[PDB]
């Protein structure tokens, strides 16, 4: 708010003995404003309580290694069909994830051609989902340059941009990104894992150089992919395994019989 808002009066308290509250009041006469209360957060036309300041903290630091952890976790989630479906992407007609497309997609220049490629690779139903999702925003956000809302479409990741970026700008919901610069805001929108990702073959091949492997160092200086604290995540099979079942006791009833 303005630094002087609610403070552009010369009001003084009347004191006590005049049968009114001790809040400061506008002096003078001849106008309806005279004698009215001022300055107080409870007063009409006063200043608000604890006025908002610009030196509030707006940006937040995150450790760079932890941010990279999150990026890798988001990329790994994009290959799990259950997370991609629960994310809300219409990926039921794609045989396998990751969806990798030949590098000629990188050289597509016209929007019509790019949409044809999306239809051929079975990705256009998610685009149609974006088209039929457009709605006027609820509330006062529409007064502030945020008039419409729609779903997120697929993310298309390339290694060389020979016209693919411009061919795909106008398509509603579709986002493009270089494999060199992949970020969480595109990879897990709303903090929800499982973005529908279309890789060109070049980008899919560059992934191993970008993030490294057990036989390739990351181009990222001093960086290695994280390790899990568990190696076999299929706990039920570990429990129902010969090694474990050979030391346990017999199991009781699932529910105890009532005895009294």
């Amino acid at each position: 708010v303005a630094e002087n808002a609610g403070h552009q009066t010369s009001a003084e308290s009347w004191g006590t003995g005049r049968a009114v509250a001790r809040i400061p009041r506008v002096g003078g006469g001849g106008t309806h404003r005279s004698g009215q209360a001022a300055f107080g957060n409870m007063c009409r036309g006063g200043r608000m309580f604890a006025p908002t300041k610009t030196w509030r903290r707006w940006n937040v630091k995150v450790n760079h290694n932890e941010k990279r952890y999150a990026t890798a976790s988001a990329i790994a989630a994009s290959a799990v069909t259950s997370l991609v479906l629960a994310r809300g992407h219409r990926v039921e007609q794609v045989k396998e994830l990751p969806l990798v497309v030949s590098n000629e997609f990188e050289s597509v220049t016209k929007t019509k051609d790019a949409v044809a490629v999306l239809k051929a690779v079975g990705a256009h139903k998610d685009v149609v989902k974006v088209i039929k999702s457009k709605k006027l925003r609820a509330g006062k956000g529409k007064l502030r340059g945020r008039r419409f809302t729609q779903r997120r479409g697929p993310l298309v990741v390339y290694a060389q941009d020979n016209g693919i970026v411009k061919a795909l700008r106008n398509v509603p919901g579709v986002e493009t990104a270089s494999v060199k610069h992949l970020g969480l805001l595109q990879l897990a929108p709303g903090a929800h894992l499982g973005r529908f990702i279309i890789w060109t073959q070049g980008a899919f091949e560059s992934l191993d150089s970008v993030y490294g492997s057990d036989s390739t160092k990351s181009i990222k200086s001093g960086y290695t992919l994280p390790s899990n604290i568990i190696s076999n995540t299929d706990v039920t099979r570990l429990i129902n395994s010969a090694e474990v079942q050979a030391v346990v006791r017999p199991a009781g009833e699932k529910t105890q019989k009532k005895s009294h």
Binding site: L143, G145, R147, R169, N170
Partner: protein, 125 residues
Amino acid sequence: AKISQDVSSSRSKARKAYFTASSVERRVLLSAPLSKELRQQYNVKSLPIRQNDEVLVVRGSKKGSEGKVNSVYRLKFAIQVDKLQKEKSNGASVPINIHPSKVVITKLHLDKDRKALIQRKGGKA
């Protein structure tokens, strides 16, 4: 999506520029599409509406009415067609204001300036 930093997507700025537009700017703001016949004749898609043009109303309750423009009432952002009237209960009759984007031009009023404008736009006349 827009790219130029000289272009604003602000709603308030756009509305203020629209409602405070001068008469000269309102002339271009009040453009009407040509019919398919005149579009093939002149190779121009839209022109600013003019007084002695002839129009077909294609939207609203007066859709299908044809007439010659009597006045481009630029102050009211509307045109007035010759016999598209509304008769009051007292017998007097008033024109029906129609926005130019809701009609198609059927016949152009031509002079040197309209012809030069048509040639500028890549058209033929």
